[PDB]
Amino acid sequence: RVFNIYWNVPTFMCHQYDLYFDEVTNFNIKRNSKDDFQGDKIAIFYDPGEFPALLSLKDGKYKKRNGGVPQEGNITIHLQKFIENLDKIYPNRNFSGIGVIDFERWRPIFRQNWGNMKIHKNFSIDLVRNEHPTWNKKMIELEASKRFEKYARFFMEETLKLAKKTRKQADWGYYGYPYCFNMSPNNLVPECDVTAMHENDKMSWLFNNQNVLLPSVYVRQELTPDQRIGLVQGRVKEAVRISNNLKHSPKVLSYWWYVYQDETNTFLTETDVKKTFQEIVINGGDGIIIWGSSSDVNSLSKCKRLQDYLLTVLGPIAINVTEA
Numbered sequence: 001r002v003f004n005i006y007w008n009v010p011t012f013m014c015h016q017y018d019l020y021f022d023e024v025t026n027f028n029i030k031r032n033s034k035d036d037f038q039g040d041k042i043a044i045f046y047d048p049g050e051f052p053a054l055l056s057l058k059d060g061k062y063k064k065r066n067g068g069v070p071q072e073g074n075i076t077i078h079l080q081k082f083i084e085n086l087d088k089i090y091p092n093r094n095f096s097g098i099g100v101i102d103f104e105r106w107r108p109i110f111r112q113n114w115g116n117m118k119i120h121k122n123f124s125i126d127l128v129r130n131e132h133p134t135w136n137k138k139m140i141e142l143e144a145s146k147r148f149e150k151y152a153r154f155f156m157e158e159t160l161k162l163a164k165k166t167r168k169q170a171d172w173g174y175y176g177y178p179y180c181f182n183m184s185p186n187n188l189v190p191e192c193d194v195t196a197m198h199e200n201d202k203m204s205w206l207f208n209n210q211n212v213l214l215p216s217v218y219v220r221q222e223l224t225p226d227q228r229i230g231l232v233q234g235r236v237k238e239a240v241r242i243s244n245n246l247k248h249s250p251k252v253l254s255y256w257w258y259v260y261q262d263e264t265n266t267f268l269t270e271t272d273v274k275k276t277f278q279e280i281v282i283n284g285g286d287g288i289i290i291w292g293s294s295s296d297v298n299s300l301s302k303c304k305r306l307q308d309y310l311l312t313v314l315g316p317i318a319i320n321v322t323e324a
Contacts, residue, residue: 001251001286005318006042006098007031008255009292014303021307027315028322029290032097038090042289044100044175045089049082051155053105054119062119069106069124070151078155079162086166096169098212098253098289101159103174108152108206109199110145112179124148153205160209171211175255178203178215178242182234183227190230192238200242207246214289215239216255219276221263228272232279240284251286258290258309267305270313277321290314 005028011021012035024031032039052066052073067073106113106120113121124144132140156174163172178200180192187193207213215235219228232254239252256276260266268276280288297303 003281003285003322004253004287005029005322006253006287006289008042008044008100008289009297009306010037010294011035011292011297011303011306012037013294013297014306017300017303019303019307021310023307023311023315027310027319029315029318040092040095040097042098042100043090043095044102044291045086046102047105048085048089048101048103049159050078051103051105051159052078052151054123055105056116069120069127069148070155071124071147072127073151073155075155075158079158082159082162083166086163093167094169095167097171099163099167099170099172100214100289101163101172101174102176103156104176106152107179108149108156108203110148112196112199120148156206157209160206164209164211171251173210173212173214173250174206175214176216177206177210178213178239180215180235180238182238183223183231188227190234190237192234197238197241200238201245204246207242207250208248210250213239213243213250213252214255215252217276217280218255218257218261219268219272221260221266225269225271225275229275229279232276233283236280236283236285252284253287253289254280254285255291256280256288258292258306258314259296264293264295267309267313270317273313273317277317281321288318 007024007029014021021035030041032041050066052068052070054062054068055065057063066077106117110121124147125140128140128144160172179196181187181196182190182192217232217235219231223231236254243249243252258267260268277288297306
């Protein structure tokens with residue numbers, strides 16, 4: 001299909017300074033009418049509903065939300081809150097754009113919960129241990145993983161079916177999937193982790209119910225310019241591989257950010273923008289979704305910076321990529 005680039009930046013927050021980013025469309029970049037954040041072309045919903053999860057109180061402690069882990073959650077409360085959140089943020093029932101469900105507190109594959117997601121593994125294990133004090137470590141871990149995955153899948157699958165049922169004309173997908181985990185400490189190469197590739201093969205239950213795949217290809221300053229290209233290369237390749245292996249080959253739209261993930265006050269150099277866009281194109285991507293944080297447009301200076309970047313760096317490259 002036509003390679004599309006979308007504007008998923010909350011620049012509506014710049015309107016107060018008389019900056020409406022009307023130039024976005026001059027570069028053939030798709031933008032919601034009136035520059036609304038959640039609009040007719042695209043809409044991302046952050047942690048919508050009430051997914052069972054363990055929330056950090058920011059003092060070392062946690063607060064359970066709807067059971068803490070999916071195997072202990074109440075699906076009705078989550079789904080009810082999901083429909084509410086969706087209507088409150090963007091009523092439009094005939095919405096026909098790209099719908100992005102952004103939930104990152106845990107992943108449905110037990111093993112894939114590291115860093116701030118790992119607490120969900122530990123809580124799942126503690127539940128089984130308290131239930132079977134006599135069991136050994138292996139038995140407890142196996143049973144915990146089984147329960148977590150069963151219900152994590154149920155929650156994610158039903159949430160997607162509800163989004164599609166109430167916004168039948170939109171293309172839905174979860175932000176970030178399919179994951180790759182390339183350019184990491186013990187896998188500092190473009191190639192995705194092999195175990196991850198295999199787990200992605202077995203996640204058709206999720207991908208078959210999405211109308212788009214949304215891998216995220218944010219780059220970091222701590223990587224060399226070439227490792228940055230490799231990070232993008234591997235992630236687009238994996239999403240395209242996954243799409244090609246599915247029945248309806250959903251379009252692959254890569255989430256991309258104009259600042260470095262580990263240095264958010266620094267914009268990508270022109271070389272990095274050019275090279276990462278070309279890498280998305282070259283590897284079979286169907287488009288790019290330019291994302292932005294509220295922090296990126298919470299001041300006049302920042303908004304003006306963004307505007308110039310668009311007119312002198314980003315826009316030219318964008319239209320050139322789609323109109324070369």
